[PDB]
């Protein structure tokens, strides 16, 4: 469990921006892997038919 700060935060929107950067990085990676999956599906279909 995390503390409750006793003073107002400073330069908060920069921290928010860095957070969003982390979020979009993870989102992009998770999107990208789906390309591997799709191409693997395609190659699998070709292989099974042949």
């Amino acid at each position: 469990l995390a503390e409750a700060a006793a003073t107002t935060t400073e330069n908060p929107l920069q921290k928010i921006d860095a957070a969003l950067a982390q979020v979009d990085t993870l989102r992009s990676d998770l999107g990208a892997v789906q390309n591997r999956f799709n191409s693997a599906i395609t190659n699998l279909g070709n292989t099974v038919n042949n």
Partner: protein, 49 residues
């Protein structure tokens, strides 16, 4: 849309007192004079008869 970039407005406390206008007085002292007066009667007192 970033941390710290602001426009700063500056004010003052303004009223008769802060301007010191309460210290403004244009009056001039009168030439005072007095005259005798009359005192009459006896007043009762809490002291019991």
């Amino acid at each position: 849309a970033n941390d710290g970039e602001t426009i700063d407005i500056d004010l003052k406390q303004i009223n008769s007192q802060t301007l010191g206008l309460d210290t403004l007085n244009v009056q001039q002292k009168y030439k005072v004079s007095d005259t005798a007066a009359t005192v009459t009667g006896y007043a009762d007192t809490t002291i019991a008869l």
